[PDB]
């Protein structure tokens, strides 16, 4: 009958990188999504299946909350059936997605004069991720036929790449914090609703 922490997933001080997106499991809840929808601060609030009005009056076994920070123009790639950097190599959603995607600008918190390089993203990979797959390996990427043994140089690049966050960037270039909710149903008494 207690309120589980939507504050520790939305108002957390520091967010994880996109290639290492944070996942939290939410169970045994009474949940009021009305304040979430009426916050009037999210630049993007969209989801698929359940109507954005009927989340509270429907019961789920448990929820998964993923959080990360990406570029603004890349927020479009967080959707089922997408392609690109994030949708292929970093964070991929299944076609039959159910949860809701929320995204808001965080320029005042994640951007500094000179360049904020703490956030990384994967750039080179042999294949595409399966849905909900996380890869944090930092093995060297071999593009050519030369079997380089962990040396960065000719035809061998470090897969992870940093991005510079400036206060002078365009609105589509500025950092955006993204939270994705996924409700799942199994042979469970559906403890999460209210």
């Amino acid at each position: 009958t207690n309120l589980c922490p939507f504050g520790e997933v939305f108002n957390a001080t520091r967010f994880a990188s996109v290639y290492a997106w944070n996942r939290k499991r939410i169970s045994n809840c009474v949940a009021d999504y009305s304040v979430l929808y009426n916050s009037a601060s999210f630049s993007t609030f969209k989801c698929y299946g359940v109507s954005p009005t009927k989340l509270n009056d429907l019961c789920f076994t448990n929820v998964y909350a993923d959080s990360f920070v990406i570029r603004g123009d890349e927020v479009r790639q967080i959707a089922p059936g997408q392609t690109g950097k994030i949708a292929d190599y970093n964070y991929k959603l299944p076609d039959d997605f159910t949860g809701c995607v929320i995204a808001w600008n965080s320029n005042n918190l994640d951007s500094k004069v000179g360049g904020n390089y703490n956030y990384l993203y994967r750039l080179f990979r042999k294949s595409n991720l399966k849905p909900f797959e996380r890869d944090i390996s930092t093995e060297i990427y071999q593009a050519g036929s030369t079997p380089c043994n962990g040396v960065e140089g000719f035809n061998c690049y470090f897969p992870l790449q940093s991005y510079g966050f400036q206060p002078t960037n365009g609105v589509g270039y500025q950092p955006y914090r993204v939270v994705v909710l996924s409700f799942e149903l199994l042979h469970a008494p559906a403890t999460v609703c209210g």
Partner: antibody
Amino acid sequence: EVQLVESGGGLVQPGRSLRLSCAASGFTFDESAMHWVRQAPGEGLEWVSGISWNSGRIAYADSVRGRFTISRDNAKNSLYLQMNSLRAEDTALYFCALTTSGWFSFDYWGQGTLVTVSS
Amino acid sequence: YVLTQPPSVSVAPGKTARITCGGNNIGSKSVHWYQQKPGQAPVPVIYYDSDRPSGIPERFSGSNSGNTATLTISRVEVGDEADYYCQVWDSSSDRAVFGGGTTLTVLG
């Protein structure tokens, strides 16, 4: 400035093949998906084909599957469409459409090239 | 997936014109609106529900909820004579479905 150019369209009789080329300049062609869209004369737009940012995912329309082949080459920023076994209803204006992020929409369009098939 | 648009919409100058794009559970997808002036290539006025590309005047607005989308043009001028299409990307079968066009004729 983004500027898309189309070429390779003309007159051909049904049965044979034709190659359409699209040239891009003014953006990062290495990170954007491409689409081939079709518009019949005096009719609504119709989507034909689409290729992702690294030739990983390729999608075709239900009425052109098995006869068309889309490809891209990032070395010279080129997009190719090979058309085989053209029926009569393939006479239309073809647009080379660009999408900046993702591959859902068509952010930038080209001037298009007219392709006519008849005996 | 099937989309539905009115064949034609006529509004008086200076008013607001509303174009509706129907569909089954269209609120679970993103609707993109394209305008095509005669003898020209289509350009997007709104994409991803309500986002506006650079260079588009603020007279264009969009909404998506339920089973119908909506494109609103405030203070309709005379240079708004074009065909308006709504596009939805069906990710279940990996395709894009367009509308059917909606001519906007300005009275006067």
